[PDB]
């Protein structure tokens, strides 16, 4: 019978772009969501790179 | 000398009773409304004889 919620009204679209968490923008039709990558691969890459010395941009 | 020397009738098929609160209804009616001389007991021979 009863539904309760919240709302947030912004004066400009720029303000909504700055003061706003991303996932809200993604849920709304404001921006597009790049395909997320697994943090496990990122940690593996970071460790591998830390293993190398000097110029490690190869790995 | 053989263990298990001491160790056949079939099971009689009867409708299942009403379980849950319903069981409480019939028990209430069994011994507070529905009849159960010579005082009363719970399933002595004489009472069982009449129903048979």
């Amino acid at each position: 019978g009863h539904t309760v919620g919240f709302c947030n009204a912004y004066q400009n679209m720029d303000a909504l772009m700055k003061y706003e968490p991303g996932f809200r923008k993604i849920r709304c039709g404001l921006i597009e969501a790049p395909k997320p990558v697994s943090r496990k691969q990122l940690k593996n890459l970071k460790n591998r790179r830390l293993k190398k010395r000097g110029t490690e941009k190869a790995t | 000398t053989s263990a298990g020397k001491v160790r056949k009738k079939e099971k009689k098929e009867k409708p299942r009773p009403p379980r849950g609160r319903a069981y409480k209804r019939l028990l209430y009616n069994k011994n507070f409304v529905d009849d159960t001389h010579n005082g009363r007991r719970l399933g002595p021979n004489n009472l069982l004889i009449r129903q048979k």
Binding site: - | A3, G4, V6, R7
Partner: protein, 143 residues
């Protein structure tokens, strides 16, 4: 009176009770430590052992019966006990050199019933409860 009752006599009363509460058999058996070091189960609900001999024990004078029991050796102690399998015809399910789980009787460590000098019960053999095997809930075709 017989007991000291002065306002500055707490120490004596404490000492008297400390000394005298060792005269109860139960309190001694619990708080002395000999029983724990003598109990083969070391204060455990039940133990796991290996059966090595299947034997029958006569009952006491007013009764007449031969009860079925087995000799067990506990894995974690290597000592010997006698454990009794009560349920009818359940000896045939127990085989020599089999893994068993053995628990206690109702009383803590006294003999129960007409069985002389027996204080343990068999409950599981080969991983299956004896009570379940007796009711045919499961079968021991793995052994």
């Amino acid at each position: 009176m017989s007991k000291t009752s002065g306002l500055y006599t707490a120490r004596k009363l404490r000492t008297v009770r400390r000394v005298n509460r060792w005269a109860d058999k139960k309190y001694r058996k619990a708080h002395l430590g000999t029983w724990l070091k003598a109990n083969p189960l070391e204060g455990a609900c039940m133990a796991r052992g290996i059966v090595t001999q299947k034997i029958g024990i006569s009952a006491k004078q007013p009764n007449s019966a031969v009860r079925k029991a087995v000799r067990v050796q506990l894995t974690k102690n290597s000592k010997k006990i006698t454990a009794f399998v009560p349920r009818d015809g359940s000896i045939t399910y127990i085989d020599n050199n089999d893994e068993v789980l053995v628990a206690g009787f109702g009383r803590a460590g006294r003999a129960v019933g007409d069985i002389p000098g027996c204080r343990f019960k068999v409950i599981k053999v080969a991983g299956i409860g004896l009570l379940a095997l007796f009711l045919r809930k499961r079968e021991k075709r793995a052994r």
